[PDB]
Request: fold
Amino acid sequence: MYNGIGLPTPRGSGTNGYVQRNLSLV
Amino acid sequence: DCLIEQTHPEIRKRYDQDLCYTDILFTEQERGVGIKSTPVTVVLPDTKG
Amino acid sequence: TYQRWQFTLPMMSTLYRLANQLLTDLVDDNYFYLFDLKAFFTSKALNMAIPGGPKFEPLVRDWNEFNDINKIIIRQPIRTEYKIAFPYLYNNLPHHVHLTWYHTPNVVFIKTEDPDLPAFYFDPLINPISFELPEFVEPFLKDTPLYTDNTANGIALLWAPRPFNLRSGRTRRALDIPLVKNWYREHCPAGQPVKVRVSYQKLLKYYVLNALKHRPPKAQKKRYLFRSFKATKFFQSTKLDWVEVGLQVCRQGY
Amino acid sequence: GELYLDCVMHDLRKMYSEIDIKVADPVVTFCETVVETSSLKCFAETPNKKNKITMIAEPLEKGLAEDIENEVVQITWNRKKLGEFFQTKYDWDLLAARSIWAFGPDATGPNILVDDTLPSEVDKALLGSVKDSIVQGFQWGTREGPLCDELIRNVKFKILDAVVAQEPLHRGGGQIIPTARRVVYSAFLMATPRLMEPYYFVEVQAPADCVSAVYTVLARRRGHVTQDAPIPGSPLYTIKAFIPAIDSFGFETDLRTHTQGQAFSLSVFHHWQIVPGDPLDKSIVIRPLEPQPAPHLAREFMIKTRRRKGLSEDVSISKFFDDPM
Amino acid sequence: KHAVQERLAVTVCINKIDRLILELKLPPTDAYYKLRHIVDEVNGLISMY
Amino acid sequence: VCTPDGIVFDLLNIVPWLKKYGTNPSNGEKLDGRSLIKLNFSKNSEGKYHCPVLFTVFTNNTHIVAVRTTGNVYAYEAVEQLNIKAKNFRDLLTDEPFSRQDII
Amino acid sequence: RLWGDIYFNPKTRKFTKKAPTSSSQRSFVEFILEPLYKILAQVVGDVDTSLPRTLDELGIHLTKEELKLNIRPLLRLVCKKFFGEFTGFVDMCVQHI
Reply:
């Protein structure tokens, strides 16, 4: 869990848990 | 450490890492840096003896 | 029995030169600043991930004035690296946290490409600086040369990675020498694809779990199975080719 | 520094207590100054409506605050020697050199309390009795500070005018002290005040190929490079810079991270400097979690610090004026 | 600066001379020049303060 | 109005309360209405409560102290810094002298 | 006479402040650094070949188990046998503190 963002574990989430930053911020 | 080694005949360095004799804290031994001042009192000879 | 070895220094320099494709090019430790074992231990304990590093399962699993947002001066964000570096300062509740090595002073060691130069040489990488005595006495070691052919190599071995840095040792088991452990203990090179990048993280993960879980070996009454077999009259002993024995193993299992 | 407080927190959590302790984010201490002399005379009158003190405030000479701090000049000296010092170094007037009552807040504090009322100075048979009272008020004001409840750095307060009440029992001393701090605050606020933040001095040593990255890191953190130099007889360079202390948190971590562990730096307190803004600008909108532009740092520091101590919301330049209603 | 202003006698030890021979590998004359540089710079700092 | 113990509250609400029930709401113990001490709070120019001598605006975090004999209310800082240090026990606004029992 | 721009004239056997030849060595370089560079180079480079000859010439004797050490403990050992106790430090602190 880098920078206080993301799932502590991706396990049982149903997904790989890849996190990217929002590109449409102003 | 060099001086202590010279004065105390049986206390020796461990061939691969140094004893930091004067760092007496588990924090200085882990963290690798001197944190707190430490006094030593020894008796040493000069060139005359 | 082949148990102990001791080599001369030309032997070690030849072996060190011949092995350099598999070896690292680091001389000091500062490359692994937040990539050492202790950083990975702290990171695991806080449930935080260094960007190249492994990820684990979490170890730990009200309205207030102290946490209020009107009082905060958001100047820089607090990264995760800072919380690894000074764990007691940036964490409420650091349990099972390890302090990391702070700094080691930079090894300014100078490689020599060409052997025809003297061992003691002012390399252009270095920034430029800018009563009677008896007839018998001389400087100490006036006969000996300042350097020999072996001097640059002998200095080169001081800053070599293990086991090159030694003269003698015990022989090791063949399997117990991984030979690639250093490649995954460094950062993954830039531009590599996703599968390889992930690969590096998994290998580091297993490296960190072996280092955590290790407890020293329990001193037990050893038994030797094959010595018990050879003490019997039913087991004879010989010397065979490996392929011959392998074929027998295949046939006997069938 | 960061390493210092990391060790303090280690000891506080693990060896001197057994407790779980929450830690806030780091922040710095600020100081308060003025850049100009006060636009009005500032007077304040006691409860017993007779004694009235007037001051003005003005910014000191630039070597001088450092000089008091370093203690090259001392209150200990006899008055003529003190006069000689000011006259010799700062082109200071003789009448001014006679006028110096004390230094504030402490005996060696970077502020000066000055007399400047010549025709009623021959009331020294009476005004001398309210010397020490006034001087306590001065010291108390310069330790507290109206703008952000922090020290006042590098200022000079001149008593332009005094009206006293010649009965000692009538004036007392307990009533001159608050009147003194209220004139102090009025004189401070009427000269346009500014905040001062510490600046750290940072020495980095690095290989050649990493030096540009040092230039990068400082640039994100309002820092700038004094000196860039090779080290004689070594393959390493030395960069020397200043960085504000609030931007230093995690500075060495980011520096070692962005340069593969090669750059290493040590930081130490060097001087105070002026935060870029008008702290009393009510037009400024501060959203609660975004960083702020360089125009309104001072406002945003001041405001946030008053919340954190628990002080009042608002300060205006007429806060400590006496009420004409 | 702190020692001079606290009124103490100052003596200097130049440690880690192996770094000149076994790391930088300077010729011995240039080792002399670098050591002389260090003792000069300490003298300059003292005469400043 | 304040009780000697230190609870401060409004007259218009307590007086009918004392007539209906002899006691004070904060405590089980009963309280005679004469014991209530009037409190006077100074205003700023803007209209907020401040300490008369220190001019500090009162907040839920400030330390607030009243003098029983005279009834005025100051920040605890002013009372401390002036009266506990300088060993006079005169009120700051008026020369009325108060004993240490009175401070609440 | 062992620091500074003084030099040595080996025919005179005396220390001159003027250099006897153009290519000459200062006294510090020729009496202190040069054997130090030679000690460390014989140890790290020639422990197998000609360290015994050099240890004889300095008078230092090491046992058979000491010569089997790796280079860093061996070098620390040789220098402890050559420089002995740290009396130069103690002289510096006695005379000037």
User: Anything to note?
Assistant: The CA atoms of residues 164 and 177 of chain C lie 14 Å apart. The longest strand of chain C covers residues 4-6. The interface with chain D takes residues 30-34, 66, 68-76, 78-79, 81-82, 85-94, 99, 102-103, 106, 108, 110, 125-130 of chain C (CB under 8 Å). The beta strands of chain C are 4-6, 168-170.
